[PDB]
Amino acid sequence: VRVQLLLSRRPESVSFARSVCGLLGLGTWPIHCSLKRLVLSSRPFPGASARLPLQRPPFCPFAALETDRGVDLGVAVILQSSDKTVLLTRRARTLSVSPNLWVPPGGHVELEEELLDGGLRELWEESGLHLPQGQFSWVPLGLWESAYPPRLSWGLPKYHHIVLYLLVISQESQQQLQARIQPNPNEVSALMWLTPDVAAAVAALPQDLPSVRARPLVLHMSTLLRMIPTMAEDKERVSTGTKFALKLWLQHL
Ligand code: EMC
Ligand code: EMC
């Protein structure tokens, strides 16, 4: 699944090297979009279902520079409990493409699947939370242009995504939710729940509560506030897009 821009009134694919953010404008708002092709435009259009914030990290490789590939599309899910807490997942210790990142569960949008289905699935592929009909609302939060490797300091970029974060707001408690959680060891090595105050801190109490059966873990604010390096390194920290997402979640509240 790819990404197109309505700069005129007739859409076009984006060339990979180009900053989507730049073509539409560190951030731009509101951005009108439809996922059905993700379509983006600074201007409204007949198809569009949401007006969203689009941001890039200050270290974006494409904004710096201003081709057998294109601009992929990812989805990631911010799952809020009845208790106003959100789930994060540390990516599996078992390596390859961004290991030990705390990120919300997410990944490639499939091909022909709707957005909520990509989220709700990716949630399930990682946490094994299946959400029962009528026991959750959802709202799209925003759009985040990213790369692997993250920035010029780590290499020229291979991957180029637009990530759409969803907020899935459950009517169930964290107790009730954590109960029926059954993660996949191969995809995630740790799960945690964030309060607003901890999220507020991460986005902008010295320790928060398993690693993976289920060994308990004390994650230290130090870790959760760790910033991104210049020189590559796979150290346990919270990704820059997740920070954008969590900021957005707080705006929502
Ligand atoms: C020039 C605003 Hg991404
Ligand atoms: C499907 C919300 Hg751009």
Domains of the chain and any CATH numbers: 72-252 (3.90.79.10)
Rounded to whole angstroms, the Cα distance separating 56 from 26 reads 5
Using the Cα atoms of residue 52, residue 56, residue 57 and residue 58 in order, give the sign of their dihedral: negative
- Which residues are near ligand 1 (CB < 6 Å)? 21-22, 25, 27-28
Rounded to whole angstroms, the Cα distance separating 33 from 166 reads 14
Both tokens of 207, joined, read 């320790």
Q: In sequence order, what are the beta bridge partners of 162? A: 73, 145
Atom of ligand 2 nearest to the CA of 38: 3
Helix, strand and coil in the chain, % to nearest 5? 20, 35, 45
Place of tokens 């709700």: 120
Would you say how long the chain is, in residues?
253
Residue 145 makes CB contacts below 8 A (sequence gap 6+) with 19, 20, 21, 54, 55, 56, 60, 62, 160, 161, 162, 163
Experimental method used, please?
X-ray
Q: Whose CA is nearest to atom 1 of ligand 2?
A: 35
Centroid of chain to Cα 253: 18
Q: In sequence order, what are the beta bridge partners of 103? A: 89
Cβ distance 208 to 224 under 8 Å? yes
Q: What's the start-to-end Cα distance of the chain, in Å? A: 31
Rounded to whole angstroms, the Cα distance separating 138 from 62 reads 31
| Centroid of ligand 2 to alpha carbon of 228 (angstroms) | 29
* Per-residue buried b or exposed e for 138-149, using 16+ beta carbons within 10 Å of the residue's own CB: bebbbbbbbbeb
Rounded to whole angstroms, the Cα distance separating 192 from 7 reads 40
| Centroid of ligand 2 to alpha carbon of 2 (angstroms) | 14
